[PDB]
Amino acid sequence: CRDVARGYENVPIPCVNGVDGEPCPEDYKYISENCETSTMNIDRNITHLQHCTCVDDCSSSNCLCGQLSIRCWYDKDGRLLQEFNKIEPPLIFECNQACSCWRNCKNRVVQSGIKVRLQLYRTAKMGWGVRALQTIPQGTFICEYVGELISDAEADVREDDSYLFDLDGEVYCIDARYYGNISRFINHLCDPNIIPVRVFMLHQDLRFPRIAFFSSRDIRTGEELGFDYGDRFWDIKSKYFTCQCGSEKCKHSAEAIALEQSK
Amino acid sequence: IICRDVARGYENVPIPCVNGVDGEPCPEDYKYISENCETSTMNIDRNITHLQHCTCVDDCSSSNCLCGQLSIRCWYDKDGRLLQEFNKIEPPLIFECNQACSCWRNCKNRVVQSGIKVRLQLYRTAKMGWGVRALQTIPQGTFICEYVGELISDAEADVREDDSYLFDLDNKDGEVYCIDARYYGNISRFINHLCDPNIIPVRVFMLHQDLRFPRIAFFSSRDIRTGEELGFDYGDRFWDIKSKYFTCQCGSEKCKHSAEAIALEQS
Numbered sequence A: 001c002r003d004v005a006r007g008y009e010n011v012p013i014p015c016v017n018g019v020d021g022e023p024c025p026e027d028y029k030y031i032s033e034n035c036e037t038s039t040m041n042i043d044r045n046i047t048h049l050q051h052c053t054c055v056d057d058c059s060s061s062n063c064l065c066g067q068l069s070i071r072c073w074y075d076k077d078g079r080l081l082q083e084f085n086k087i088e089p090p091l092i093f094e095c096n097q098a099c100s101c102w103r104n105c106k107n108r109v110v111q112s113g114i115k116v117r118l119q120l121y122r123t124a125k126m127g128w129g130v131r132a133l134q135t136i137p138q139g140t141f142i143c144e145y146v147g148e149l150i151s152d153a154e155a156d157v158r159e160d161d162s163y164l165f166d167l168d169g170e171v172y173c174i175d176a177r178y179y180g181n182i183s184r185f186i187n188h189l190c191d192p193n194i195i196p197v198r199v200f201m202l203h204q205d206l207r208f209p210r211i212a213f214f215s216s217r218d219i220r221t222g223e224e225l226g227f228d229y230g231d232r233f234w235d236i237k238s239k240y241f242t243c244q245c246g247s248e249k250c251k252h253s254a255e256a257i258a259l260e261q262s263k
Numbered sequence B: 001i002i003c004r005d006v007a008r009g010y011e012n013v014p015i016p017c018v019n020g021v022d023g024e025p026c027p028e029d030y031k032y033i034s035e036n037c038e039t040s041t042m043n044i045d046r047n048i049t050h051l052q053h054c055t056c057v058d059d060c061s062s063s064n065c066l067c068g069q070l071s072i073r074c075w076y077d078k079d080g081r082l083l084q085e086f087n088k089i090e091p092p093l094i095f096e097c098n099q100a101c102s103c104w105r106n107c108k109n110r111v112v113q114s115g116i117k118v119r120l121q122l123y124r125t126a127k128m129g130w131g132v133r134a135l136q137t138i139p140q141g142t143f144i145c146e147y148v149g150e151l152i153s154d155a156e157a158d159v160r161e162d163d164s165y166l167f168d169l170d171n172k173d174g175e176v177y178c179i180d181a182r183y184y185g186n187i188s189r190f191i192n193h194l195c196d197p198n199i200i201p202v203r204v205f206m207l208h209q210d211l212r213f214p215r216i217a218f219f220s221s222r223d224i225r226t227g228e229e230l231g232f233d234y235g236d237r238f239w240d241i242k243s244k245y246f247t248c249q250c251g252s253e254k255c256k257h258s259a260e261a262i263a264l265e266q267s
Ligand SMILES: COc1cc2nc(N3CCOCC3)nc(NC3CCN(C)CC3)c2cc1OC
Pocket: A152, A153, A155, A156, A157, A158, A159, A161, A162, A164, A165, A166, A171, A173, A229, A230, A232, A233, A234, A236, A237
């Protein structure tokens, strides 16, 4: 498959399988931006946007939008700072339409979409996954977790929860089971190389942050991308199946889980 | 020619401003936006399942495309220009392909959602203040730009005193809404009225199909020469209100809103 994204992303995203006869997945709708099925009532009031007054490229410390994360966390190249808290990331507020800066300012990384070459491919033990077709320096924006915005009440009534991302006031979830992007195919890794960060762009409704994946380290060509699904995932799912990341750091293998109960 | 792009890089192309008539600097008492904004909720139907979509897997140039069928037929040609036969007097509502469609994004039913492609220039006119012109020829049927502004209700439009930048959206059912580009708008806010206009508005649906909120796309109604001023017909509601304050200066011999013209009708 030449482009699973049907031209909706900045770059084509191919699918390959060199492991078995399983065909490229088609039981979902590809979308490049979050969708709704019943109103979420996102606050789109342009006068509720906090914005900056910059006349430069927003690389100075006086930029309010940068100040909303204590400081802008991007360097000149669009990458997270070396000092960035990869354990507890702050909320990033990117420049918006209420700002006076141009569209090519330095605070517009995530909203400018995918730039690295990625591949949907068949793994050996985890079904489909995504890997890099190129080296990727630490701090690089990879892709966004795109799906269907739903409420916790609705998340409760859905049988399939294998593609849920939590957004925790009142709680909401991103559900990429029926509608989603390339992110829906990223596997859980006990030794992860991408992290999620909560980000705001066109609106600043704090109930609905958007999820951006950045690299936590240098990633070699062909390396599988993975993040930490967290314990709420594994507390539910482990009585059905156990982790196959194979790391010696694995925290969710049948082996690891059994060693724990002995103690 | 001080400002190289009034859109601050938000459009596919830059839109420069020049003034060769007086000392008035490039206008800045408004905010440039490349898309419609809200100030109080419009509650647009954004239900992705309420989208009518097609099953096309080709470039949607087929007769089978449901999206094209919604306007009876896709009215764009292979180059993205309106058909010669397009009703330029009472234009149909056009439904372009969307995210629920199975076609790729480089489909042939996606002209307006692909944004501006011709070179335009904000410039100082002689008798009408600021205007917009072509820095290139524009063939008939070509998409120029969209009328972008603040989505408000008819009720709210009644309450705002400055009404020089309003476009009416009169849905069949009633429940009328307006685009107000006085405080927020794009290059379209600077386009002047022409009694013999060379652009027409078309109502278009793209990312949503909330019928209360058509998006307004301007196409050329005829060939336009390089340097020609762009204009549409603002309509009678505009002039029925404004002509007791000022009169039309389009200078056409077809003008129907000049002091001359207005005086001739009383008999
Ligand atoms: C990050 O991964 C998961 C997040 C999940 N989040 C919720 N909710 C958020 C809180 O508010 C109730 C919803 N429910 C799940 N599961 C429910 C459990 C109950 N089931 C009937 C419906 C799905 C999840 C499951 C996840 O992985 C398996």
